[PDB]
Amino acid sequence: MVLTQQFVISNADLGRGHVVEALHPSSPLIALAGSKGRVLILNKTGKVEHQLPMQNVVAMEWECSTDTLAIITSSSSDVHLYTHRTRQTDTIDTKLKDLCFVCWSQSQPLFAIGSKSGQFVLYNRRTLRLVPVADTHKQRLISGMWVPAQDSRLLIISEDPSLSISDAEGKVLTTIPLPSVPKSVCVSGMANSPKSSSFAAVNLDNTLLIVDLRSYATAAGQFNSALGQITCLTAGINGEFLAGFASGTVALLDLAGSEVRLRGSLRLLKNAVEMVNFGEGSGVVAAVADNRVGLLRITEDGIAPTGDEASLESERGVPDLLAWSRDGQQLFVGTNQGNVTVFTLKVLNVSASYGTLVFSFTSNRTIGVKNLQDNRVVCTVPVNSDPAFISAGMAMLAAGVNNQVSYYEYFIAHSVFLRTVEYPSPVTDLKVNSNLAAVVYDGRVQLSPIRDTPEAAAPVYFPESGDTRLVSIALSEVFFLYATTSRVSVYALHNLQQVATFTCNTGLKRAFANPACTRVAYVDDSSELFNVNLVTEVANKAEGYDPDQKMVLWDQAEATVFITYDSEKCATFVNTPHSRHGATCESVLVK
């Protein structure tokens, strides 16, 4: 955890009052509104271009499907739409007074306009026909959200406890009254499920009743009365649910057949959760209670306190609205006193790979290992700091900053730290295998055993006797490959003896060895790509090689295909080992 203050937003910007924020799902832009009655859109440079005066702000949102900004007023029945891109103004009359909320569907081009009387309608733009629905609710609506899936269902909550189910014609089949007003409800969907099966849980303050809408099976869940009422309800991970308690205890619930088993419970916080949010794209749970911030992560062993406490100044105000961005990089918190504090949650774009395993960052201190075979996370690596660059091998993951590198021995599911090693020069690039490691510095490569055995082999420095500068290296289980502008050399790790050496007359800028250290797709000075088979030592230029695209990735599933890309596009090269014309390396073409 690193707390760095970039800038301070005083109350003179938005005024003393509620702070309304709107985060663009794709663009790095945010709209802000306050008691000043103006619209402030913040760019990457923080410079104010123009202020849009609009008073009595209620809510804000940005649309992703058509990138259209919607502005509504509470004192007028007409809605004015202003397009910033075309500088055009239009007026569309919804014929409803005292508007309270506006929401757009990110999956379908369908929108609904509501009223404080509890009426929701469906608008057909093509036919200009509106179907009025009346007498659905008798009190003021609280909130209304859309389900981001193929299920075209609209959920609106209010202070009158009722559940309405209607067909395509809008006919209400039945209405079941509830003993008390529900507090909140959330819907979670399964992205990997083709049919997107979802279940809804209804809370009855002191009771939890689960009704299966498909099998029509009714079961009564008995819970201890000493647990207390549920404070907040939010969606969990893989259909799980997280419920708070008056005692502040967070409990993990497991479903064993038809029973619920309490494996363990820990009282982490003493007060109720003021605000809770769930990040679907990040899977991170954060809770704020008074001047305390807690982070909850679902682990196999349970919940353990980190032992670190931070005190927040009371002069910044008590938070009342909290919204986490989908990407998890931008955090904006608005306070009722007009003070806005921005926290930078850095997630490094440093990644590595080995075989079917890809190593990326899930949090600041955890490296996530994803297996492409199953497309799911299989293991996690603890990280002491934020590394500048990471590299992967077989049962070895290295992560380094500047001139130091920390080594972990991951296994597939646990990780074991081995050692942190400093080097006299910054490590420009790094490769590693299970037993040894190659670190690039002094214009050369140091190959050393990572294990700190008292009888370890003496580390070696490559190239020897001096040829030219090294351009790139690669490492495998038994082979060490180093490429210069003159020669590409492979050494057997069991003896450090030269076996393969290919001389390139046209030079070399960037070499890209295959995972088995047998084929090198290297780019010479003449902007040409040569697919050299290090076994038979044959240099074959790649047909159709665009010199604009510079980077090469070798496929891990197929040993005859690799990909050449630049910042925008990519092309696939196929390596045929034998044909009438010999071994070839050809770009895939179009019909």
Place this chain on the structure above:
Amino acid sequence: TTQPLPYNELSLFRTAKYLFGMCAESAIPINVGKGAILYTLSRIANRLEMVRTARAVFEKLQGVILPVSMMEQVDIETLLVRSKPV
């Protein structure tokens, strides 16, 4: 070559030498392949540390066709066999 079955090492080595000797004399009979016998001789010579013989039959094996799930392994084997005293 094609089955995970128990085998003798020296007997298979001498069988491979005999097949290599008598396969180039005339037209090879149907369903007797040079790739399989060369791969067997190379692997057994590498295992039995016939390193000079192994690299000779490997440089010969470079000039035949192997199954689609064998080229990578034979590349690794022939690159590793280039070490060790001849």
